Amino acid sequence: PHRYRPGTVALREIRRYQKSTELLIRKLPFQRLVREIAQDFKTDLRFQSSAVMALQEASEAYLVALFEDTNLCAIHAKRVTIMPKDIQLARRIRGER
């Protein structure tokens, strides 16, 4: 019958994930994603492994920066819950679209 007040697990996971560094997305689905969208530019390529790790690091850093600027937007609108008009606002302001 013991359950937390909602939000506590959220904040402790925030601290638990900021106190560590690792690859965060599971590696083989991301590798299959990279090969599948590299199909369209030159058929039957041959990657190395370190290039795939470099892509995973670049994409992970880009998503983390995007979500922090999204969270700034959502706190600015006197809300807490992130809605995708925040993300579209952030990529409209930053200049990528």
Binding site: F41, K42, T43, D44
Partner: protein, 366 residues
């Protein structure tokens, strides 16, 4: 044969238009005389024939076990000749597909061809030795004598009319021979570069006149006229009508053929799978084409009376014609779709004006 009122600014091929996603593992391609069929060899030794007007697969004939790498049509369109690593002089029918000739003769063959008027005389180009001309009934074989015997790579063919036999070694020396008596009437070494010679890969001809092509190995396609060879005669020194190359990517070629009217030249890469089209007369590139960006090109065809081009890559045979644009006034010719304010006053016979067959044509003619 087709519509005569169709020519609303006809074009020269631009689009992709859709391919034959039916049977892969294609190896070579060639059309018949009019441009109505297309034989295509498989990988295991079969024949794929595709009809054009119905856009339908005509006939599948299983020849042998060795892969089919050389094909040609007869003049009537009834005798297919072919040869492969099977070493066999073959001859096939189009209504039945019968093994009419079977003579396993060594040094496997790289190219066959009929004489363009008599289908009795057929061309045989061995693996090493000099090219051979044969008959149909008996084994009368004519090996053309070569002074070199050192390349063991000699190319030869018949031209449009079958008047002569243009021969070529892999040193770039040409020996013109008469088509029946083997008269060495003309000879020339190709003026390659500054001085140093090159090999000869293949030689093809036209459908109208005597302009033809030389496919060397120094990445330079050369265009000559056969009447200039005839005007020279022996110890000729021809300089070409037009030279062809692409030094941006320095691309050696794999296959060439002419247009139907002898006006345009297509030639294909061995590296990029990207087709180029040239003008014969004025002498420049007109259009680059593309495709699947990382495939290896094998064989390129052309359709004579209609701008259709066949490619071969990864066993897939493309067909490229305009993705043509349809409009109104074929459903209703009394109405024409304009664009802007068109004025109608030029005729003067308006405002209530009132003024004051015998051809017998056959119905079952040709």
């Amino acid at each position: 044969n087709l519509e005569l009122l169709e020519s609303f600014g006809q074009n020269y091929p631009e689009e992709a238009d859709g391919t034959l996603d039916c049977i892969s593992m294609a190896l070579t391609c060639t059309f018949n005389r009019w441009g109505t069929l297309l034989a295509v060899g498989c990988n295991d030794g079969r024949i794929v024939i595709w009809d054009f007007l119905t856009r339908g697969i005509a006939k599948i004939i299983s020849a042998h076990i060795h892969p089919v790498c050389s094909l040609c049509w007869s003049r009537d369109g009834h005798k297919l000749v072919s040869a492969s690593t099977d070493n066999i002089v073959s001859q096939w029918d189009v209504l039945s597909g019968d093994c009419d000739q079977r003579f396993r003769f060594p040094s496997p063959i790289l190219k066959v061809q009929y004489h363009p008027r008599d289908q009795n005389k057929v061309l045989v180009c061995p693996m090493k030795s000099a090219p051979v001309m044969l008959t149909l009934s008996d084994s009368k074989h004519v090996v053309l004598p070569v002074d070199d015997d050192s390349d063991l790579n000699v190319v030869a063919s018949f031209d449009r009319r079958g008047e002569y036999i243009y021969t070529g070694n892999a040193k770039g020396k040409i020996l013109v021979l008469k088509t029946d008596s083997q008269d060495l009437v003309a000879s020339f070494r190709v003026t390659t570069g500054t001085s140093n010679t090159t090999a000869i890969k293949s030689i093809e001809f036209a459908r109208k006149g005597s302009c033809f092509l030389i496919n060397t190995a120094d990445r330079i396609i050369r265009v000559y006229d056969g009447r200039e060879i005839l005007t020279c005669g022996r110890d000729g020194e021809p300089e070409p009508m037009q030279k062809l190359q692409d030094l941006v990517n320095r691309t050696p070629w794999k296959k060439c053929c002419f247009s139907g009217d002898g006006e345009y030249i297509v030639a294909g890469s061995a590296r990029q799978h990207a087709l180029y089209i040239w003008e014969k007369s004025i002498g420049n590139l007109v259009k680059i084409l593309h495709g699947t960006r990382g495939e290896l090109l094998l064989d390129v065809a052309w359709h004579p009376v209609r701008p259709i081009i066949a490619s071969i890559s990864s066993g897939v045979v493309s067909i490229w014609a305009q993705n043509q644009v349809e409009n109104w006034s074929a459903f209703a010719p009394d109405f024409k779709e304009l664009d802007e304010n068109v004025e109608y006053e030029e005729r003067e016979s308006e405002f209530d004006i009132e003024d004051e067959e015998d051809e017998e044509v056959d119905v079952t003619s040709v």
